[PDB]
Design a protein around this ligand. Structure first.
Ligand SMILES: Cc1cc2nc3c(=O)[nH]c(=O)nc-3n(C[C@H](O)[C@H](O)[C@H](O)COP(=O)(O)OP(=O)(O)OC[C@H]3O[C@@H](n4cnc5c(N)ncnc54)[C@H](O)[C@@H]3O)c2cc1C
Ligand SMILES: Cc1cc2nc3c(=O)[nH]c(=O)nc-3n(C[C@H](O)[C@H](O)[C@H](O)COP(=O)(O)OP(=O)(O)OC[C@H]3O[C@@H](n4cnc5c(N)ncnc54)[C@H](O)[C@@H]3O)c2cc1C
Ligand SMILES: Cc1cc2nc3c(=O)[nH]c(=O)nc-3n(C[C@H](O)[C@H](O)[C@H](O)COP(=O)(O)OP(=O)(O)OC[C@H]3O[C@@H](n4cnc5c(N)ncnc54)[C@H](O)[C@@H]3O)c2cc1C
Ligand SMILES: Cc1cc2nc3c(=O)[nH]c(=O)nc-3n(C[C@H](O)[C@H](O)[C@H](O)COP(=O)(O)OP(=O)(O)OC[C@H]3O[C@@H](n4cnc5c(N)ncnc54)[C@H](O)[C@@H]3O)c2cc1C
Ligand SMILES: c1ccc2[nH]ccc2c1
Ligand SMILES: c1ccc2[nH]ccc2c1
Ligand SMILES: c1ccc2[nH]ccc2c1
Ligand SMILES: c1ccc2[nH]ccc2c1
Lengths: 393, 393, 393, 393
């Protein structure tokens, strides 16, 4: 275990090393709505997309905590990069549910392979000899422009067209065609465009049931390494929350950094630190962000402990983790509003990084897996053993 | 009084009549960072910049409540337009502190005259024969590109250069030169650029002491009409809050309008109205916005009552009004965050008006006169008769 | 109308006149869990139980606003008295749904008649010749010990025992028997004991359908005076909220009164007013209480306007009023927690009135008609025209 | 270290073993305002007052985390007992700053010795031959009736009467005289009465400077065991917060336990679990309590890590811990208000444990060391290196 703490220290140190490159390409990504080439280069050199890739394929093969800690530091430099990087690892982790044939095809000669994934069942597939024929239109395809493969969920149907089952299908970039639909006010460089397919062929070995994609049966398998025992869907939500969290932490640091050089208009306080109302308010806001940090870590640690222990997390724990992530990001978005008040009107200038953290965090926070209202109802429901209101845990 | 309620109904009806024009020019203003010509035309035709202009100059000469109600409806169509319109009236109201010579020069042949004003003392003036010589750089000059005059606050100095007093100075557009400094993520079309002057001459009749600009001695003057008895600085803050409020109300209406046609991902709720967690949350959020509405109205009514009654508002009332406006906008920005949660990820699309209300309201809310933390300390301080932490009330 | 504002001023002045008597009997009522005789005397002398009694029976016959304003001032002296007084008027207002025979029997020779009422259907009634035979056990019978009659809701059944309909039944104190069940930590003097009946006879003229008790058909009846056109159930909730509100306002006044004579342990602030963190926080807390005040008044005014105008309030307005009252009391209970923080450890001493307001307001706030969560779901539901989750409006 | 986790499991198991006795004496303690004899017996048998007593004196000598975890479970049975128990250990820990002579006198033949302590400098002491002469009146003396000694802070003065320095003085029960001043609405059995002294003699060996009482110089001393390297004042605040936290957790468990057997009046929801508005709200409230739990643990772990590592905590860390404890208890008191709303009117019945947790937690939370507003200003101030607003850290 002392190894995994040491590795984290190195990967966090890499983010600081490569950070300047990510920070350098912020303006272009905002402008173009995709990651600059220098950034993608840096992501590939740094191996930050390989944290949840297996060691057998030359990956780093870390744990949930390490990915989270890396995510939070990355968001300081560029929230979009942090979001793409984390979604790639999460997508790479989900690919471990596919057969060895698929995994070998994807990672065999590509240690730094990068996957996209959209779980919304936006397509229909039919049985054809040797595999499936897939058609659909999948929005919110994060980082699809730079990814090698994509995991797409679809609804299987028969010759007549009646639904028979859910599928999770791994298709390469060569078969992909991407529509430009990502025009947003935050997380712009994420390039979460729509993936389109039209009668695209997918072989048997690169298709699993959606029922098997959600599986946590690997939790008790001693043959697998700890990482692949982890509850992947929960783990993905945790690291996504870390991206949002990290942006909020950067917003706090900035407001602290600039407070002694600014006043509170139109008050007598020429310095923001001179106002004890400002200081206590900032102390309060900081403690909310600290709570969100403790929330994300609690969940990350629960997933890591169970993975190493090779025990299956009960539904109640998974339901609680979904509440933790929703609560954490909800605290951050409220904290950001409080930080804009603390800073003042200059925060909304395009030259100011504060509005950038504000916009990126707020946009990313409304990801399905981070829904605070759904999270509350899930966690609240676990106390009475009610039916989960979401299909996947 | 039944007249002033009838007039409001007509002016609100005008906003709806001209609204389509304002709504039509939203995309261009966002792009260009200034109001389209059709909008400025509509503002001049509608007389919405003449609400706080005197009847003797062919103005409408209404009251605080009416301006507020017009402001809130305007924000539905374009928050930037609402902000410019309201700042013009407020600036026009502040001009009534100047001598008749200035007022005649400004409004004599221009019933629809539009003033800018920045109160931050960003310039220095010296005595010269017949007037003053003024130099400075004044940021945040709202709607300056379309305005005829500008009220600029400056610090008077002597031949040696030692501060002697504060001044409020009315200078025309012909003497103005505007720097392009307004690059923001919200309230973009407001064109709050920097006003620059360099050894510009201002005559005696268009200069008053800053000490007289803040004056509320007109409160008891029965010679003046009610409007000009009103506490102008307080009244300006109230209508500014109305702009922010109105945006929040439009955000609420939109979320209500779209809820039955959307789901809550990734939950079983295919319709947002099917979730009672969604409905109660929306009910709660709506009640916060309702409180902000009641806050702004309370203040508006206090100012109007005293103006018609010809009584001077004590400091405690003015201090309370400053708390009301800060509280109202603080509730709206928090409510907007809650509405983004209610709506979901689609809210951050550029095609969606929700992120537009969100950004515009949040940017405008950090106006000095709307500072929530300062407002709290002011109102709290009035309970114990502490010294106000702001110079103007 | 200038009369009803003048009358309010007098009735508020009466509360101050008789206030010392109510304040004098606080300690005894706390001890004995019922109102002292001096208090009941004062209630009868002051006519504060006759505000919603008809003028034809020698009552004051005021409006919702006046009752609310009286309620808020009463809570300063003794919250329990305020609660009893307001419940009596509300119960007296509900009696106007009964036939003239009942009203004459109740108010004919008793202008200062005081009714109790519990709406929870805790009893069953059967048809007998000339009336009904009633049996049941009704908890939460506020002020029953001092009341002359009681309005009890029951479920009608047949000889076999199958439910047939809902009833509202007016029975006198002579037929009542009261069980001592009111052992609480707040609102102790309210004496909300359980009313018990056993095969008690109730004649036809003192029984109406529960369906007619909830009726708002009197809203458009020009024959009735304005008061009896008012939506009684909504009006009762509003004045109940006023009792809770008034306690919160008294808590605020006390904290303001004592702040300059106390410190903030263990800080350097020997005076609470010396801490600007304390002052701004108090300013914030005060603004929440101000919002609750504006909420209650908004609702009161909506009910009064419609009553005088003789128009029926649509469900949406009534649903909104239920949200207003729940929001108002929710703000007050949160504000009280904030005021305890402001004051400090001395607040929880039995000698300190602050913990008394705290306990009384918190207990009363959980009245069914003041349920904040139900209120939110009701008001939220009105936006989409959903079925109300409560039977009565 | 695996020992200290094992010991905790046993001490938590002891609280459950002896819990029934504490729970049994709740009604009497509430009535009499002091701990029943069976409780004091149980405290002495269980060794729960000996957690922060040295092993050399036959104590358990645990750490901050263990005391905290024991505190939280104790509050389930009786919050007052938990508060007394924790204050005794904290007082016993502070006694380690005194010389060996004092420690031997106190703990030499009394392994289960129980100390009181009040830090408010409410007394004056003068130099006399062989020691000091002490006079004063010290309020809030928790558990003084059952304690063997008391640590009292005083101001040293000269023959003339001018202040010279601060003192911390250890005096036995034989020299104590206790005034009955503890009449409160929560934490009643704590018996926090006033300690009075009149020209009482205190020898040199049982007196240290207040300057040495606050000392953290023991942090780096490898001669001392880890427990006595811990920052005692910070550690005391942490365990006090644990008492409040534990009460809030018990309130949550109760509301969860009773929800399926209760309805939400006056709604259609016959069961509380049937309302998804109730469930999500409870989920939200639970997450606030979870945050407070994570706050207290974070602080406890920071103190324990530094103690075992033998490093001195910088001021910034100590300032942060003071923010954590204030935030945690602030979350709990707000959470309790939310839980009363969830439960309903039955919560305020004297027979219901919910109002007991509510009152006890709220009273205890206003302890100086748990002041949320002071905590915010302290933690906020650490970001800019401002002077601490409290004398002790
Ligand atoms: C920046 C961003 C990226 C997202 N990426 C993905 C993704 O990669 N895969 C996915 O399944 N869902 C993703 N989502 C989920 C998406 O938010 C929901 O499906 C969304 O709520 C759909 O509703 P709508 O409002 O867009 O219509 C993402 C959301 C955001 C904001
Ligand atoms: C959209 C907007 C318009 C503003 N317009 C004006 C104005 O017209 N006049 C003025 O005096 N101040 C105005 N202000 C005030 C301005 O916000 C403050 O002076 C500001 O806090 C200065 O601090 P800074 O952070 O910009 O540096 C405006 C602020 C905003 C956000
Ligand atoms: C102080 C108080 C007085 C109340 N008085 C009445 C009343 O007079 N009539 C009534 O119908 N309901 C009254 N209620 C309503 C009562 O709160 C609800 O019926 C309650 O929620 C029942 O649930 P329970 O938790 O008591 O069980 C009162 C509540 C309180 C706290
Ligand atoms: C239940 C309780 C116990 C307390 N016990 C102690 C104590 O043992 N020692 C101490 O120094 N302070 C203690 N305090 C601190 C006390 O709260 C403060 O000194 C208090 O704020 C003094 O202000 P006042 O409002 O009582 O006057 C305690 C407070 C409470 C509520
Ligand atoms: C939930 C679970 C897994 C996922 N992979 C990509 C998106 C996404 C959402
Ligand atoms: C405060 C008072 C008046 C003002 N006029 C323009 C800005 C502004 C701010
Ligand atoms: C709701 C409506 C009317 C009522 N009368 C007494 C209680 C009560 C509750
Ligand atoms: C702060 C620090 C230490 C203490 N001991 C007893 C009370 C108390 C408060």
């Amino acid at each position: 275990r002392s190894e995994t703490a040491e590795l984290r220290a190195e990967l966090v140190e890499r983010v600081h090393k490569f950070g300047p490159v990510f920070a350098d390409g912020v303006a272009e990504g905002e402008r173009e709505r995709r990651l600059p080439d220098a950034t993608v280069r840096a992501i590939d050199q740094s191996q930050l997309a390989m944290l949840w890739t297996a060691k057998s394929y030359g990956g780093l093969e870390t744990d949930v905590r390490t990915m989270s800690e890396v995510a939070k530091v990355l968001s300081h430099y560029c929230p979009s990069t942090s979001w793409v990087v984390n979604n790639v690892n999460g997508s790479n982790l989900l690919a471990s549910k596919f057969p060895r044939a698929a995994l070998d095809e994807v990672f065999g000669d590509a240690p730094g392979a990068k996957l996209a994934s959209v779980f919304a069942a936006a397509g229909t597939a039919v049985r054809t000899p040797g595999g499936y024929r897939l058609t659909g239109s999948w929005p919110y395809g994060t980082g699809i422009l730079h990814d090698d493969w994509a995991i797409l969920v679809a609804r299987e149907v028969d010759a007549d067209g009646e639904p028979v089952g859910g599928l999770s299908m791994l298709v390469p970039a060569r078969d992909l065609t991407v529509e430009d639909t990502w025009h947003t006010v935050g997380m712009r460089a994420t390039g979460s465009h729509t993936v389109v397919l039209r009668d695209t062929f997918v072989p048997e070995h690169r298709v699993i049931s959606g029922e098997l994609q959600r599986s946590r049966e690997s939790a008790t398998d001693l043959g697998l390494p700890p990482l692949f025992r982890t509850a992947a869907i929960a783990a993905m939500a945790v690291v996504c929350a870390s991206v949002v969290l990290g942006a909020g932490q950067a917003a706090r640091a900035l407001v602290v950094e600039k407070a002694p050089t600014r006043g509170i208009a139109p008050s007598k306080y020429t310095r923001q630190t001179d106002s004890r109302t400002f200081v206590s308010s900032l102390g309060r806001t900081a403690l909310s962000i600290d709570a969100a940090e403790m929330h994300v870590a609690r969940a990350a640690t629960a997933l890591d402990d169970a993975a190493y222990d090779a025990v299956a997390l009960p539904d109640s724990e998974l339901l609680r983790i979904r509440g933790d992530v929703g609560q954490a990001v909800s605290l951050v978005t409220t904290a950001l509003d409080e930080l804009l008040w603390a800073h003042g009107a200059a925060s909304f200038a395009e030259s100011n990084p504060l509005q950038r953290y504000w916009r990126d965090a707020n946009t990313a926070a409304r990801h399905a897996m981070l829904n605070v209202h759904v999270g509350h109802e899930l966690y609240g429901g676990s106390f009475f053993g009610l039916d989960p209101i979401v299909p996947s845990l």
